[PDB]
């Protein structure tokens, strides 16, 4: 059913193993990111960030997570908003129900960020709303011990480190390096769920696709499998993953539409797009160990 | 708000207009069919198929046309099974939440259309829902008096009358012919609401944009405006349409495809499809005569 953020990465944090965080923007999105964790028997947050939101509607990003929720009723699920940026953004997810929210003040000086999170999570527990806040930059890493008090003092309920990701299907020039070192101080002096973002792994059967239907990828890398499974051993709880999702359906949209120029069925377009995307993430459910964990 | 499709019709068959009914399978699709209606204070049907209703489930096909009401609530709006093959379909809808539906036996001889139209008809009519049904095949034209008696003895609230048009993008191999006489005599005879399915005109603009971005649509011909226009002078008052809003929506995601190799946004496809998409739905509704009819 449809839960608190923090009811799954409690759990996620307490037997070592990461929960995906997926986002969407659609319908096709929503339905396979769900069979997915149907399939794999695994917990997952299905999140928006705040562009999606104006794109779907608040009313109908939840309203067809709500129909999903009731039609695998089995499955943990937490709505969480995606990259909050302002009080009210987060204050208007929460009135909508969502389960979870991001506050991102990450860009923001040290007690700004601890100022504007704690605001956040005063609003949100109160409503019974998990909360998730940043340190670093994504483009300088995290503080530990900035990290330790920040916590201590705001109470949210899990934290993004800043720790060598980016957004984006571009996110190392030469090597892809993370520091866990940094990652694990951070865990445990926090001793709560840490999150990861930018994680998207760009498969190589994924970019393989996008590139056998005419896309363009030039230079594209992504978080390896094997850093993935690191920071999770590491203590990231929540796994970030958005990139992945969007280039295996769009292979899938590209490669029908070059393959018949006939072809305006919406449905033979994003039959396939979701069947890829599912795949993704199954696949990755079972990387970060959230597979038959129901 | 959403409301029986006789509510809607009975009205358009009085005043002597047209109501678009629009298929849907997804949100994209969905989201643009409402915001024409608002922008042209049209009421409307949106209508899904066996076969969208498979692809959405029927949970949520239902689910998101509420939320779409909610979000609207001052558009008429009836939600419509579209060629609906069996009594047990049609039951499904109407349980799901439908609030009109097709039964479609116009390729059984009179005597079991009628049969099973009849059937329909009764379990619908219990339960508040509209009921439409077909005579004739889209491929031999109806017989007039032939209406007359299966809506006399069926109770059926709307007629589709086979007149000339098919469905889809192939409609005539010559100049463009419709039996309008024939129309009018089933009018005339049966004074309900009546039906035009097939009804797609694939406007120049849609084609244009639809070859521009690289389809193909050799061959391609659909119902001239003009001949729309007759067809409502004629006592047509629901108008099926469906390939229009296809190829006008895939014509912009293969122009994204094709612009830009290395887009994979969801979002930078399907903003620009569902602008054309609530375009030809806007023009539609000001051809048909429902614009501010609100
Ligand atoms: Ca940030
Ligand atoms: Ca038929
Ligand atoms: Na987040
Ligand atoms: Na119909
Ligand atoms: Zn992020
Ligand atoms: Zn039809």
Chains 1, 2 share one sequence.
Do not use: W
Request: glycine share 8%.
């Amino acid at each position: 059913m449809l839960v608190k953020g923090n009811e799954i990465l409690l759990k996620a944090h307490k037997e070592g193993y990461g929960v995906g965080a997926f986002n969407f923007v659609n319908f096709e999105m929503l339905n396979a990111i769900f069979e997915a964790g149907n399939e794999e028997n695994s917990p997952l947050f299905i999140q928006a960030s705040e562009g999606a939101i104006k794109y779907m509607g608040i009313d109908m990003a939840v309203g067809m997570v709500k129909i999903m929720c009731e039609r695998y009723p089995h499955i943990p699920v937490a709505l969480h908003l995606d990259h909050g940026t302002t009080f009210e953004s987060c204050e208007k997810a929460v009135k909508a129900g969502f389960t979870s929210v991001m506050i991102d003040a990450s860009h923001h000086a040290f007690e700004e960020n601890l100022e504007l999170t704690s605001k956040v999570v005063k609003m949100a527990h109160n409503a019974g709303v998990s909360v998730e806040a940043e340190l670093g930059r994504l483009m300088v890493l995290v503080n530990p011990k900035e990290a330790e008090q920040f916590v201590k003092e705001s109470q949210v309920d899990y934290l993004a480190p800043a720790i060598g990701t980016s957004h984006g299907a571009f996110k190392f020039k030469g090597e892809p390096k993370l520091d866990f070192e940094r990652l694990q101080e951070v865990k445990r002096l926090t001793n709560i769920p840490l999150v990861l973002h930018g994680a998207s792994a760009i498969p190589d059967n994924v970019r393989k696709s996008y590139l056998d239907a005419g896309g363009d990828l030039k230079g594209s890398k992504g978080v390896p499998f094997e850093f993935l499974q690191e920071s999770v051993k590491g203590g990231i709880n929540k796994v970030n993953t958005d990139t992945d999702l969007r280039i295996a359906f769009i292979a899938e949209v590209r490669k029908v539409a070059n393959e018949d120029k006939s072809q305006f069925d919406l449905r033979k377009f994003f039959s396939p797009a979701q069947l890829a995307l599912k795949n993704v993430v199954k696949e990755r459910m079972k990387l970060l160990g959230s597979a038959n964990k129901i």
